Each structure stands twice: as structure tokens, then as C-alpha cells.
Design a protein around this ligand. Structure first.
Ligand SMILES: */N=C(\N)N(C)CC[C@H](N)CC(=O)N[C@H]1C=C[C@H](n2ccc(N)nc2=O)O[C@@H]1C(=O)O
Ligand SMILES: [Mg+2]
Ligand SMILES: [Mg+2]
Ligand SMILES: [Mg+2]
Ligand SMILES: [Mg+2]
Ligand SMILES: [Mg+2]
Ligand SMILES: [Mg+2]
Ligand SMILES: [Mg+2]
Ligand SMILES: [Mg+2]
Ligand SMILES: [Mg+2]
Ligand SMILES: [Mg+2]
Ligand SMILES: [Mg+2]
Ligand SMILES: [Mg+2]
Ligand SMILES: [Mg+2]
Ligand SMILES: [Mg+2]
Ligand SMILES: [Mg+2]
Ligand SMILES: [Mg+2]
Ligand SMILES: [Mg+2]
Ligand SMILES: [Mg+2]
Ligand SMILES: [Mg+2]
Ligand SMILES: [Mg+2]
Ligand SMILES: [Mg+2]
Ligand SMILES: [Mg+2]
Ligand SMILES: [Mg+2]
Ligand SMILES: [Mg+2]
Ligand SMILES: [Mg+2]
Ligand SMILES: [Mg+2]
Ligand SMILES: [Mg+2]
Ligand SMILES: [Mg+2]
Ligand SMILES: [Mg+2]
Ligand SMILES: [Mg+2]
Ligand SMILES: [Mg+2]
Ligand SMILES: [Mg+2]
Ligand SMILES: [Zn+2]
Lengths: 56, 124, 205, 104, 159
RNA sequence: AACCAUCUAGUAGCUGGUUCCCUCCAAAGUUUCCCUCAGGAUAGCUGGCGCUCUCCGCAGUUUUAUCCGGUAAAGCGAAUGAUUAGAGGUCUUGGGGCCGAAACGAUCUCAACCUAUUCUCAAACUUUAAAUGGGUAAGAAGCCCGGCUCGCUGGUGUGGAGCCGGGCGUGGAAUGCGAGUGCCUAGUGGGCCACUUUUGGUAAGCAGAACUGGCGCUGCGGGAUGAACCG
RNA sequence: UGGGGCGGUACACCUGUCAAACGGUAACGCAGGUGUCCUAAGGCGAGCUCAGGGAGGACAGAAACCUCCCGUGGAGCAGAAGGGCAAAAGCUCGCUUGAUCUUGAUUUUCAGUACGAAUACAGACCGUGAAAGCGGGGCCUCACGAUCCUUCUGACCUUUUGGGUUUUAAGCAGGAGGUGUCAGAAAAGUUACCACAGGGAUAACUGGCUUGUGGCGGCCAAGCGUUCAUAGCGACGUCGCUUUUUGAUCCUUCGAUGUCGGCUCUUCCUAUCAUUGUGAAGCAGAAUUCACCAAGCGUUGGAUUGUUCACCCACUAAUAGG
RNA sequence: GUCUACGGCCAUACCACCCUGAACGCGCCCGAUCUCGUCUGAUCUCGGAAGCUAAGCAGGGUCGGGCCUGGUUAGUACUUGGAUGGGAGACCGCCUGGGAAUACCGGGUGCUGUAGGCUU
């Protein structure tokens, strides 16, 4: 029972019916995978904005 | 016309027949078979009210102003043409020479500058 | 012994020359590719005659051999032992394979080497014959008799070139008198103006 | 291969690098009073024969050699295992190879 | 079946050009990359450490992260029908500032200039780009001599 | 390895059959894993149920900018690798002679080497090198001002990022069009034909791929006749 | 699995090509490799520059050692090939062991799940170097493995049952013992005494397409034929036809197309063995050769072998082929 | 005009050979006591400044080689898409659009940033 091994014949047509959708673009990405030393420091900054509030 | 449009018409040359139409052909087409796209509906261009309601903001109140913009490709072409529903022309009286080939090799496809008018008179 | 030429006519596959990979090849038939009076100056044999192919096909080495031999024989009978120089211009590099059937069957069928053959494009020269313009028709009759070994269709065209050069015959003598071109055995050296000038001095002195 | 017996490396408890005495690892004697052995022996007992599988396709030749790293200072004496790549030949501290020598 | 090796079909891609082997010019290192800067990729054989995978070759993205000597970078890879934005750690040597965005930014700056001026005057300057138009009518002065007559040459067989 | 009944309606990835109308939508024979190749799962394709907004967003498209690419061709007087032909050299050396014992004395030579030339080539050689194509951008998520925080880094109220507060609308290429989103979900996983490129094979209505479209799911006019041809 | 079997491993891996200029792509297609090796062939720093060739010098010689000059890499870097490298990734010295401890993030295969492999950062202790730095194995691209069980190391760690102590066991975290049919059953043969479900997804006859092989036939004319190429032949080469051989293929049928030969019997094809009519001969006659029209009418009796085929005796006008 | 230290682009800057260089620098140059390293104070390290541009370096030169850039090669080869176009096949022609490479013949031979010199 020999049988055909591989093809890519009607695949394009399948993909384009529902569409080659772009990745949902979004402002504000996560900050996952960002150098912890920098991130630590930004966290401490947001923590201490409160102290220098009155001047603003 | 412009580079942007003409390159697409090149890419589909074999399926179309285009050219430079005359004023009378514009009259015949608009007047006889004018149907506007009003509220997503194919409604017949029988009174100017139907135009004033939609295009009053461009001082377009009648068939004539419309013609003027079309022949003089004025400012507000986009709106004037998108208002017009694709023209349902009939089968050509007299016949066609040969659908498959280009005009130069004795066919109908492609740019046949002026002879489009002769073809319109045979199709309308 | 060997097969007919219907099998290896058309340019089907890619070129599969002898190399590192294909070894164990039996040697080609045609080894002496030119003959006549090869030891001969350019000026004495002006007239050239080509045999032009007109089909994108493969000619065998065996036909090259037979045709060379028959042309030699006729020219020997006609124009004597020292009145020409034949030059075959088609070295056969493409290797042809053969699928032998000795119970395995058709599986793993990749051929052993049978032999060589030369690929040809339209307008490529096969043979050339240089002698004087006097013996033009006899050259013609030799090449017309040689057509019958090869297949297809080929035209017999007399060349405009003076011998085996890329320079036309009418302006040639003026160029040689003023020493642009210089004979150098069978070949001929084109002198430009770009070299150093003391060479030009050595030339005219 | 050949590797030297002393190695200077990390200790978790001390926190520093300190010398370690190196020696290769061995399998212990299988305990009779473990849990798995009690379970086997009770299932295998009585009629029914071989209950659990016996592996028979020993394909590959070599092991990963393991090192028992004893710390040298008398307070610690803490050991720890250290794995290495496959090797056929092996030896401890045998003739650290010379350079620029003659062959006989 | 082919193999799924990392450097398959990279005999020529990474090979450095002719008479441009050797040392890497130091601008490459000593130039700076901000966040959100649009950056295009070009592999390089000399440095084997931190090469991107050949698929991302050519692709251009924007920089989401920075380290001592490298940048994480967002690219849109197509797989069987869905695209995936995915992030790659590339050492600097394989990288260039793509200059596509700079001309646009020049045009915004030009419009704010051209709007501040020709504002008080009241002249309405064309801001928009307007596609290549149909060329206008003109006169061809045949000053004197007449057109040279071209004739189709007759055939002649060189070969 | 007898006969009767019971356990027994014993299991089956295998054949076979499976009961009224109309209306609406409408497929696959491909990926990866499996003692998997007459079978499943799993992604893919499909339907139905809805929901959030609409009367700024998106597109199998072009244009303008800007990168990427190493096939066709062409090349060997350029690299690598084969390869034919004659010229000029002296010894950089040698085989047959001949007057020479021999001898780079000479002597005919013919040999290899060196220099300018010349005929022919390359899927696993290439300096050059296209057409078709693949990417990224074409503005409010933007530009420009005024100012706070930092345990990071730093000659420097430096750099960088982050924080607040105001100000600019001709919305910044052509064309078209309503978008987004979440649940549950059956069947299929035996394929095939034609234009072009292409591999094995002498070839085959043969075997194995790419790109696009059809048949299978689809009747019609023509080709007398025909699953795939032309309309 | 181009019927199965026997044979290969294309059953997990890696390089180059095939690939049609992004990437991705198949055949029991091609050319090839792997189940290791390393105490340094790993890690820093300094200093050196290779292959090959030329001219010289006792023994010395084509080839031993010293010296000057040229030397874009023509050598070398453990290994397959491919890419990469010159005050270096090569070669020689000096000191060392980041081949260590530990969280998570990402890339490659991809279902975008795992293993493996690797890349950017971060926190500790270190190494080296005057110092900027560099280093968490081998210049890059391959060298390897789940649950369950056992085993070792680790904390003044938890439980061991009505309470308390102490042995033992069970827990927790991290390595190892191995599954190569490599996402991992624990496994030898025969049936012609045979049995059951099904298969034209799959052979052994016929039928179809192809014609290598076989059979027949053309073109050129170097030579035989005394002579003279072509009366009769025709090499080295080359172009076609046929489907009575043989092979290659699997579209049809496995809920059954009765499978070798002989006997008997009809008709049919022509590529003419003989007869009728005629051309040509190195045809005097006879006998014998080559070719055209032509297939209406004929083409045997027997020994041996299951034989078709083969070989032989005897008559004949002839004992042609399908 | 021109140079030095540190450079960016990395041959219009390289190679070969010939000619000329005012002033300070750059160089060559003479020594080994200490620091330092050698088979050897030649190289490397250190202490001097009588002599000289011979060389290095610079600039110019060569119907030079090369490299860089143009024309020619050529609207050829090749190619996206089309047709009941041809042809026994091989292959070929046309429409619509894109468009190359040698030989050959011309031209060119470093640009420049900071700081500091000489011509006081
Ligand atoms: N026990 C004896 N003596 N014999 C001969 C075997 C009997 C078996 N059981 C029956 C049989 O006939 N076996 C044959 C059948 C066909 C098969 N075969 C035929 C043809 C081809 N091309 N291939 C095949 O495989 O071979 C079997 C055999 O001979 O073993
Ligand atoms: Mg009528
Ligand atoms: Mg082929
Ligand atoms: Mg028992
Ligand atoms: Mg039942
Ligand atoms: Mg039953
Ligand atoms: Mg059945
Ligand atoms: Mg390639
Ligand atoms: Mg080519
Ligand atoms: Mg289901
Ligand atoms: Mg097929
Ligand atoms: Mg099939
Ligand atoms: Mg359909
Ligand atoms: Mg249809
Ligand atoms: Mg018909
Ligand atoms: Mg059609
Ligand atoms: Mg159609
Ligand atoms: Mg099987
Ligand atoms: Mg590719
Ligand atoms: Mg491609
Ligand atoms: Mg660290
Ligand atoms: Mg290495
Ligand atoms: Mg388990
Ligand atoms: Mg398994
Ligand atoms: Mg034959
Ligand atoms: Mg004769
Ligand atoms: Mg079948
Ligand atoms: Mg039946
Ligand atoms: Mg029957
Ligand atoms: Mg006949
Ligand atoms: Mg000295
Ligand atoms: Mg000097
Ligand atoms: Mg020059
Ligand atoms: Zn310790």
C-alpha cells in the first residue's frame, strides 16, 4: 500500500479564506525580559514619586 | 488615470478593454442607465432631489454638474464615482472579433484608444 | 555493441561531467582533434569553412570521429597532403548513463557510465577547415558528405574571418603592414598602444 | 582520560572556593528492606511467575562517570556528586603529558 | 529528507564579500541604538557568537531591550498561516539602522515648517503627495533639418 | 480433537444494510507523535449560537522611498578544477643518436619547465549578475514646550528612563470595503488531471516534487463520441 | 517495502547538492559522516608567523643542519565536508581550573507541547591580566534519553499516628544505573493436514500504453568481389517500422473469466517456399541468384521427447512464416 | 604651503623602478652604570646627541601593472503574464512589460576630524 508522502497543494487557499491576520498590535507591551537592574530602579522611582509631589 | 492605476490595468490587460471615451458616450451612459448607490441601495437617478440630499455639500445639484466633474476630472471625483453603481451594460450588438487576443494581433483586449466609442454604440 | 542514438539525443538532464564523483569512466574515442598541416603560417591559408549546427541536441564522440576521418580522406585524394588544416571544435564532456537489468527489479536504479557526448547550442561551430580560397568547392563537397554522419540539419557556411582569427580579411593587410597585428605562428598578436613605449621602439628597430 | 586528584572549587556551606579530594562513585548494595523490594517480593510470591519486566536490549556501551568531592577542611567533610561526559578509557593522575619529546 | 541544522543553506549568505574579510570596522560597535528604533538585520560569519537564525535574515524590527553588548528585537515571522511576533537576542555586529523612516520624518518636519510659513499669507500649499500625473501638452520645434529616415536592415548570416 | 445445553446478544482497526418534505450555509485527503501505514489523537479546514462597537480601522493590490537575495546567463587573456593547438627561451634537467671516449664543446634532435597567445567546459567552481519576488515605513499610539522622582550609570542640578502639566487638526500617497471577538462543534486525514520549471529512468495513460487552476462536490453550449479540453 | 521473501535502513542524528536568487519542500535519488577524543587538544596574557620556492656553505647526497630574500594564507586549527582566522582562532612560554553555585527570560525542532543544544542578561565566590576587560567547556554547524524502581549527596528540615525517647522506613531537592524499532511491549520456528475476516489499496494468465532486448527495413560508401565502390555485398556511423519474444508498469476483475501441450475445425494476414506473367545478373544452354504485380489454389508420411521448440530418415513442385 | 601625536572611511591610499626634499620635528646614530631581557645589549629596556639625509618617510615621475569610474558590447542573450500561433518532434516566432556580463576604447590615482608645531 504505497502512498504519496508530502504536498503543499491547496494550503494557500485554505489560509487565505479566513485570512492571514496581523498580530494584534498594542501600545504598552509587557516588560517581561527586561534587565532587572534597570527594572528595579524604575520600580523604585515609581515608588518615590509621591515624595516630590507638592512642587508639581 | 495615473501611474498607480495604469500599472494595475497592465497587470490585467487580457481581461479588459479600455480607452479614452468621448462626451456623447458619457451622456448616453449616465442618462440612460444612471443608478445611484443611496443608503446601500441601487436607486434610479430620476430627480435632482436624490442628488441634492447626498452631494449638496460639493455644490453638486444635477446631472450636468456631475458630467462636468467627470469630463473635467475635478476635485471631487472619488465621491462622484463611488456614488455611481457599476454600469450594467449589455451584450454587444453586431458581435466581437475575437475575445481571446489583443487588439494589435486582431482582438479586442487592451488599449484601443478611441474605438471604444464604436464598441459602446454596439453594446448599448 | 553499444546502443542506438535515439536514446541519447535530446538535452534532457543536467550536465554530468567527469570529476571526483564520477570515476571509473571508460575513455573517449576521439583523441586527435585536429589534423592536416597544423604547422602552418596564417598567411598561406586564408579561407575558412564552418559546419554550423541548427538544433539544441547532443552529438556523440563516435560521429565526431567518423566525420573527421571521412573529411580527411576526401581532402587527401583531392588537394594533396599539404593544403589544409582541419580543426574540430567540440570537446565532449557530458557523461551518459545506462540502466541495466542484470530478482530485485527497478528499485535503486541509478546507472553506470556508458560514455561521453557533447551538448550543442544553436549557432555553435562544429568543424572548421582552413586552406586557400581556390579550393572552395572541394571543401564544400567534403563537408556535404560529412553531413550524413550527424543528425538533424546543419548549414555549410564559409567564414569571413582570415583563418582562425577574429579579424576581417579586407583591412587585415593594412593592419599588418602598419604592425598592429603580428604573426606568431598559427596565432596573431594584437598590439595596442597601452604598453610601454620602449617596446614600440624595439618593434620598429 | 586522566584527571588530577585535587580540585579547588565551591562549597555551598562555606561559601568560598576550597580544596576538594576527588574520588569516583560506586553503586551501593541493594537494600532488602526497602519499600519497592517488599512490594516486588510479595507480588512475585505465590503462583503467577514473572510479574514485572526484564530488560534485554542492552545497546549502548558507556557510562557517565561521577565524582565524589570531599571538602578538605575538618569542619565540613561534606561531599558532593559531579557528573561528566562519556568516556571509554579512564585513569587518575597518570603522567601529565609532556611537550616536545621524542618517540621510541 | 533534509536535516534541520541551524546553518543549512548558508554557504553563501554569511560568507563575507570579496576583499572585505578580516577585521570589523569599529563604527559597528561604537554606534548607539535607542528603544523603538527601526532596525534591519544582516548576518555576519566572523562572529559566531550570537548569530541570529537564518530565517530572521533580512527582517527588520523594533528594539524592546538592551544589554551591555546586545539588543532584543521584535519580528513578524509567518508560520503556516498565522504570524508570530517573536523576539531575538542579537549581538550588535549583525545590525544596521534602516533609513526608511528618516525621509518620512523629514517630511513631517517640512510640513510644520511650510505650515508656519504660508500661514499668515493665506496661500494654500499642497501638503499631500500627489501621484505622477499625465504629462502636459507641449511644442516640438523642428528647427530646420528633417527627420532622419530609419530603414530595417536586410538580413545577413554571420555564422 | 466427537456430540447436547449453558457462560453468550461473547470481541472485530474488516464487508454489508440504515425508513418523510422544503429552505439556508458548506468541506478534506496536509503538519507532528504512536509496534502508526486498511487506524487514532493533535493542529489545520467547517457550522451553529451569540456578544462589543459602527451608519476610525482592514486589504492575497499598486505607487514612492529603503534593505535583502546569489538561479538563468556570462566568464576562464581573473581564482579552483579539467583541456587542444602551435610560437619564443636558456638550462631549470633528461632520453635516442651521430663526428665526438664522454663532456651544459658542439651536433641533429625530441623532452619536460618559464613567458605572450589560441580552441572548448562545470548540479556539488565564480569576480560579475538580472527579470519575477520577500521584508519595513507612509502621523494623534504623532510632533513641540515647562517641570518633578531614581537606591542605576557618571569628572559635571551629566546621560538614560520614567513621571506630571499645557500647545498644534489641510488627518498628511492612489483604490476599495462595515469591522472586532468569545464559546461549543460533527465529517475528512486512500486522492487525481492540465500549462510551466524539474529529478530517476531509453520511454511509459510510470514512479517522486514546486507554483496556479480545475475534477472529485457541477449540470450547460461546442470538440461526432468522452470525468478533467475551449467558452 | 515499485507483489511479498532474501537484501538495504533511507526507523534518531549532521554537512554539501538536488531547491526553481527570502524562508519551507519529496523519491530504497546522489556524494558522505556519527554513537567518540581531550589535564588540556579547556582558561587568561605576552611573544613569535605558516605552506612552497630561490642562492650559498666540510662530511651533506633529490632528501639531515645554519643563513638571506620573496611568501593574502596556496599550511594548520583531533575528527565528515563546508564557512571563518595573520602583530590571530595558527605556533612557542608563564600562571591557573567559570568544565563551579543559583533563580527565572528567550531562540532552534515545533502542536509553536517536550528532550536535547545554544544565546542574551542578573545575583554570589573565583581565575587571569599593569589595566579597559575576558571566562560560566572544546572557533561555528552533530556527538544523545520519560514515568516507575534502586542508589548517593544535602538541612540541628517534616511525619512515623493516645503521649514521650531512641534505631529503621517513608517524605523533600539535585545527580547517576536505560530503554539505538532511539516520545521508551519483556519474546524463536513450521504447516503440502489446515482454518476465519477481507483485499484487485497487492502479485502469478489474458487485456491496455511504451519497445530497451529480439525481429524486419532504409541513407552515406571506406573495402571484398582480378579488374571496376554499388552484379552480388558493405565496416566505422546514422534514420525508421512492427508487437508472434522477452522484460518494465498495475488501470480493470480475488462473493472465482477453468490455468501447459496434443487432437479436431473455420477463416484470416503477407514480409512469395513453389506454380502463372515479367524485369536484372560476374545469365551461352542447363542449373542458380536479386527484384516487381500477386496470398485465389497448395505446403506431407514417420523414429525419440509430456513437450511447444530441437535433431534426423523418406517422397516431393514445395516440404515458407504468423 | 607642510608636519607631528591620536584617528574615521579602508587600494583614486597597493606593487615595482627612477628623481628631488628650506626650517623644526621623524629617523638613522654612540654607549651598558643602575631597572629589564638575551646564545649574542642585534631585537626588546635604559643613559647620551658628535655626525648624516645615504636609506626610511614625503612629493613628483613612468604611452608602467593593478584598483576605481564611463562609453562600446546591446535593446542582443535571458525573462513575468497571453493566444484554436507555427512545427512530425526538437524547438521557434509574435504581443504585452523588465533588462544584464567580458574583449575593445576613454578618464582618474586618496578624501578628511581634534589638539599642537615650522616658515619664529
Ligand atoms: N513445500 C514445497 N515443496 N513447495 C513447493 C511449496 C508449496 C507451497 N506451500 C505452495 C506454493 O505454490 N508456493 C509458491 C507459490 C508462488 C510463489 N511465487 C510465485 C511466483 C512468484 N513470481 N513469486 C512467488 O513468490 O512461490 C512460492 C514458493 O515457491 O515458495
Ligand atoms: Mg443580427
Ligand atoms: Mg533526468
Ligand atoms: Mg506459585
Ligand atoms: Mg448484535
Ligand atoms: Mg454473535
Ligand atoms: Mg469484497
Ligand atoms: Mg544555490
Ligand atoms: Mg548557463
Ligand atoms: Mg470525531
Ligand atoms: Mg505522475
Ligand atoms: Mg498511481
Ligand atoms: Mg469548488
Ligand atoms: Mg467546472
Ligand atoms: Mg473528434
Ligand atoms: Mg483553456
Ligand atoms: Mg475558460
Ligand atoms: Mg510490511
Ligand atoms: Mg532557498
Ligand atoms: Mg526558491
Ligand atoms: Mg557573575
Ligand atoms: Mg577552536
Ligand atoms: Mg508510568
Ligand atoms: Mg515505542
Ligand atoms: Mg534493436
Ligand atoms: Mg576495390
Ligand atoms: Mg490498480
Ligand atoms: Mg466475477
Ligand atoms: Mg465460468
Ligand atoms: Mg507485397
Ligand atoms: Mg650595540
Ligand atoms: Mg631620509
Ligand atoms: Mg594602467
Ligand atoms: Zn566548605
Amino acid at each position: 500500500a504505497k502512498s504519496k508522502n508530502h504536498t503543499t497543494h491547496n494550503q494557500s487557499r485554505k489560509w487565505h479564506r479566513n485570512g492571514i491576520k496581523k498580530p494584534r498590535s498594542q501600545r504598552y507591551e509587557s516588560l517581561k525580559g527586561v534587565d532587572p537592574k534597570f527594572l528595579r530602579n524604575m520600580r523604585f522611582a515609581k515608588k518615590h514619586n509621591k515624595k516630590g509631589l507638592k512642587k508639581m | 488615470l495615473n501611474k498607480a492605476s495604469i500599472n494595475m490595468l497592465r497587470i490585467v490587460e487580457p481581461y479588459i478593454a479600455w480607452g479614452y471615451p468621448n462626451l456623447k458616450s458619457v451622456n448616453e451612459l449616465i442618462y440612460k442607465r444612471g443608478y445611484g448607490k443611496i443608503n446601500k441601495k441601487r436607486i434610479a437617478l430620476t430627480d435632482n432631489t436624490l442628488i441634492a440630499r447626498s452631494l449638496g455639500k460639493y455644490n453638486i445639484i444635477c446631472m450636468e454638474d456631475l458630467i462636468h466633474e467627470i469630463y473635467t476630472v475635478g476635485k471631487h471625483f472619488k465621491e462622484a464615482n463611488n456614488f455611481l453603481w457599476p454600469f450594467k451594460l449589455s451584450s454587444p450588438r453586431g458581435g466581437m472579433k475575437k475575445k481571446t487576443t489583443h487588439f494589435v494581433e486582431g482582438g479586442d483586449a487592451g488599449n484601443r484608444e478611441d474605438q471604444i466609442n464604436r464598441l459602446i454604440r454596439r453594446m448599448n | 555493441g553499444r546502443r542506438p542514438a535515439r536514446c541519447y539525443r535530446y538535452c534532457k538532464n543536467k550536465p554530468y561531467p567527469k570529476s571526483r564523483f564520477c570515476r571509473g569512466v571508460p575513455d573517449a574515442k576521439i583523441r586527435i582533434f585536429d589534423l592536416g598541416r597544423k604547422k602552418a603560417k596564417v598567411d598561406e591559408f586564408p579561407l575558412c569553412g564552418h559546419m554550423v549546427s541548427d538544433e539544441y541536441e547532443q552529438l556523440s564522440s563516435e560521429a565526431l570521429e567518423a566525420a573527421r576521418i571521412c573529411a580527411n580522406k576526401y581532402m587527401v585524394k583531392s588537394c594533396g597532403k599539404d593544403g589544409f588544416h582541419i580543426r574540430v571544435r567540440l570537446h565532449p564532456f557530458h557523461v551518459i548513463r545506462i540502466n541495466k537489468m542484470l530478482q530485485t527489479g527497478m528499485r535503486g536504479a541509478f546507472g553506470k557510465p556508458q560514455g561521453t557526448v557533447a551538448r550543442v547550442h544553436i549557432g555553435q561551430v562544429i568543424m572548421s577547415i582552413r586552406t586557400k580560397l581556390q579550393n572552395k568547392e572541394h571543401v564544400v563537397e567534403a563537408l556535404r558528405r560529412a553531413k550524413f554522419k550527424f543528425p538533424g540539419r546543419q548549414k555549410i557556411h564559409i567564414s569571413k574571418k582570415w583563418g582562425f582569427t577574429k579579424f576581417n580579411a579586407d583591412e587585415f593587410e593594412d593592419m599588418v603592414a602598419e604592425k598592429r597585428l603580428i604573426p606568431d605562428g598559427c596565432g596573431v598578436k594584437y598590439i595596442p598602444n597601452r604598453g610601454p613605449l620602449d617596446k614600440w621602439r624595439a618593434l620598429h628597430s | 582520560v586522566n584527571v588530577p586528584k585535587t580540585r579547588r572549587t565551591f562549597c555551598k556551606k562555606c561559601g568560598k572556593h576550597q580544596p576538594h579530594k576527588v574520588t569516583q562513585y560506586k553503586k551501593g548494595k541493594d537494600s532488602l528492606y526497602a519499600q519497592g523490594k517488599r512490594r516486588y517480593d510479595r507480588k512475585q510470591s505465590g503462583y503467577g511467575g514473572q510479574t514485572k519486566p526484564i530488560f534485554r536490549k542492552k545497546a549502548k556501551t558507556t557510562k557517565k562517570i561521577v565524582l565524589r568531592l570531599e571538602c578538605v577542611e575538618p569542619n565540613c567533610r561534606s561531599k558532593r556528586m559531579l557528573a561528566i561526559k562519556r568516556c571509554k578509557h579512564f585513569e587518575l593522575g597518570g603522567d601529565k603529558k609532556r611537550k616536545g619529546q621524542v618517540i621510541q | 529528507t533534509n536535516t534541520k541544522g541551524k546553518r543549512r543553506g548558508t554557504r553563501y549568505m554569511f560568507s563575507r564579500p570579496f576583499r572585505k574579510h578580516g577585521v570589523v570596522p569599529l563604527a559597528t560597535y561604537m554606534r548607539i541604538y535607542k528603544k523603538g528604533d527601526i532596525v534591519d538585520i544582516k548576518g555576519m560569519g566572523t562572529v559566531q557568537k550570537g548569530m541570529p537564525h537564518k530565517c530572521y535574515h533580512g527582517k527588520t524590527g523594533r528594539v524592546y531591550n538592551v544589554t551591555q553588548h546586545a539588543v532584543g528585537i521584535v519580528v513578524n515571522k509567518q508560520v503556516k498561516g498565522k504570524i508570530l511576533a517573536k523576539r531575538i537576542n542579537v549581538r550588535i555586529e549583525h545590525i544596521k539602522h534602516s533609513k526608511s523612516r528618516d525621509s518620512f520624518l523629514k517630511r513631517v518636519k517640512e510640513n510644520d515648517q511650510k505650515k508656519k510659513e504660508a500661514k499668515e499669507k493665506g496661500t494654500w500649499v499642497q501638503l499631500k503627495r500627489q501621484p505622477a500625473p499625465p504629462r502636459e501638452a507641449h511644442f516640438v520645434r523642428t528647427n530646420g533639418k528633417e527627420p532622419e529616415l530609419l530603414e530595417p536592415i536586410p538580413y545577413e548570416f554571420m555564422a
